[PDB]
Design a protein around this ligand. Sequence first.
Ligand code: HEM
Ligand code: HEM
Ligand SMILES: [Cl-]
Ligand SMILES: [Cl-]
Lengths: 181, 181
Amino acid sequence: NNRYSFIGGRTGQWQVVKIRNVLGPGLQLVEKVNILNGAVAEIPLDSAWRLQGFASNIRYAIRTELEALQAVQPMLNRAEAILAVLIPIKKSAQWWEMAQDERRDIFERESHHTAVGLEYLPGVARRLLHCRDLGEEFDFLTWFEFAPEHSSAFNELLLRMRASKEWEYVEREVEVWLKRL
Amino acid sequence: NNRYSFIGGRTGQWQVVKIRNVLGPGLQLVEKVNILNGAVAEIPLDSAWRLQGFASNIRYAIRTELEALQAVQPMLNRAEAILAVLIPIKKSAQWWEMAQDERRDIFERESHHTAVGLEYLPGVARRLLHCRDLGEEFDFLTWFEFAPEHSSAFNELLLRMRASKEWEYVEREVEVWLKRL
Ligand code: HEM
Ligand code: HEM
Ligand SMILES: [Cl-]
Ligand SMILES: [Cl-]
């Protein structure tokens, strides 16, 4: 199954450390996030919100970028990676109406998204889900996990991304910080 | 709503003229196709099959290409567009694991998908839907409609595309030919 659901409420494998409502309307604070590998129609009891999205194909990265990523990126579920951060993102209509070269140019040529992210590997593990195509309020669910040592670096990475040309098209962002139970 | 469903069975706005099972397991012949703008979980009565997909953002076309398409491409549901073809396509794992430059190159540089297709506009209208990401048996639903004067031409277009490098990656294809009621 390529579909993943994230349920904020009173149960789950993760503990909410904090939520930062960076841009746009925020998400309600909850005790825990429950993550599932399937669609969930039945909104669980004592749960404030459901996010969902699917794993998909590459949309921007070229072969050499892929090769570079594969050489250093860590797997998920390292025993040390006890911290995680869920970051929903929505981009603007002006971004989506742009052609594929335009988007590619802003993504790597101007914002160096891959080159910058590579500096934070192997400390940081990541998963990218898509959800615009499902009719969700956000376009993307981004997932990061790392050991505490790397929390500082990760905060540094967030502030760099937010300074890029790419982030000018971002109209909604929340940080959910998590600790594995 | 970005989601479209296509049900084969005994009702619909379109009459099945024929079904050609081009490559891989085919679709059961039926009398009619019902086309809905939404999901359909409730498998309709006396129906053989259901295909669905969503309209999505551009994945390959560059801005100059988009400009050429917009100059000529017809709208859907012209009075004279009484013939249609629905063509589900599945591409191979090997296609899907390739990077974004690699697919772009096979699609346009080697296959000239857009340059070739542009020779058949404005006679042919088209819609493109995606459904790998929903876990369908097909990766894509393609939709083409035109006046009969253009049928021969449309047939030439199919044979050109299928001789392309792109089409070596296609592992399942069915043409459903229709007539408007
Ligand atoms: C930590 C290292 C990171 C690496 C190595 C990295 C790498 C990548 C790569 C290669 C893609 C393109 C995937 C594709 O072609 O389909 C991507 C997409 C994305 N990344 Fe990152 N990323 C990192 C961190 C982050 C962070 C911190 C954020 C946001 C807070 C972020 C947000 C995104 C978004 C939204 C996309 C999808 C872009 C779109 O389709 O418009 N990334 N990431
Ligand atoms: C009639 C003129 C045609 C034109 C102008 C045309 C144009 C295009 C364009 C520009 C794209 C790229 C969309 C994007 O970047 O998101 C595309 C995708 C596609 N076209 Fe065509 N097309 C035509 C006919 C056909 C026919 C007859 C078929 C199949 C029988 C076909 C199958 C496809 C498929 C499967 C894709 C998606 C490829 C992918 O995302 O991997 N096209 N078409
Ligand atoms: Cl990923
Ligand atoms: Cl289209």
